[PDB]
Amino acid sequence: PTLPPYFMKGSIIQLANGELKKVEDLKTEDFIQSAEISNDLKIDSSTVERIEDSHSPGVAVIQFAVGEHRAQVSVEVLVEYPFFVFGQGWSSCCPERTSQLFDLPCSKLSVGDVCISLTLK
């Protein structure tokens, strides 16, 4: 998988209400309100369960307990991939690199971290 440009600081993100924010300024509320406004999308907590920094070069595999039942989910993203932890900004498997490429305040992604994900409903 390749890195997405939008995480780059100074990037402007269009919210639910058409409002414009720079990626480095997005807070939690911004996602919540943005979701409560959208009639299509819904927010879903994706607590981390396992970070088996796995397989190949600099990539990682993360498992989440999604849904109100703790569905066992998996994902495969580069270690520097950012996650928006509830009320604690972004986080990652390699905070140092994340914060090098995108120049964003990256906390260490640990098990237990309740993340933000989207889904339809």
């Binding site: 997405p4 939008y6 995480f7 990037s11 402007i12 993100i13 269009q14 919210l15 639910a16 414009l20 990626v23 997005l26 911004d30 996602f31 943005s34 959208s38 999308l41 879903d44 994706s46 999604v66 989910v73 994902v75 996650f83 928006f84 993340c115 933000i116 994900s117 989207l118 889904t119 339809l120």
Partner: peptide, 25 residues
Amino acid sequence: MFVWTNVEPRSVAVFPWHSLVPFLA
């Protein structure tokens, strides 16, 4: 006094919030 009629805008490449987060499904 005069209103600014022929005012061209500035184009800014923007990104959708929903794109910055993993979509589950």
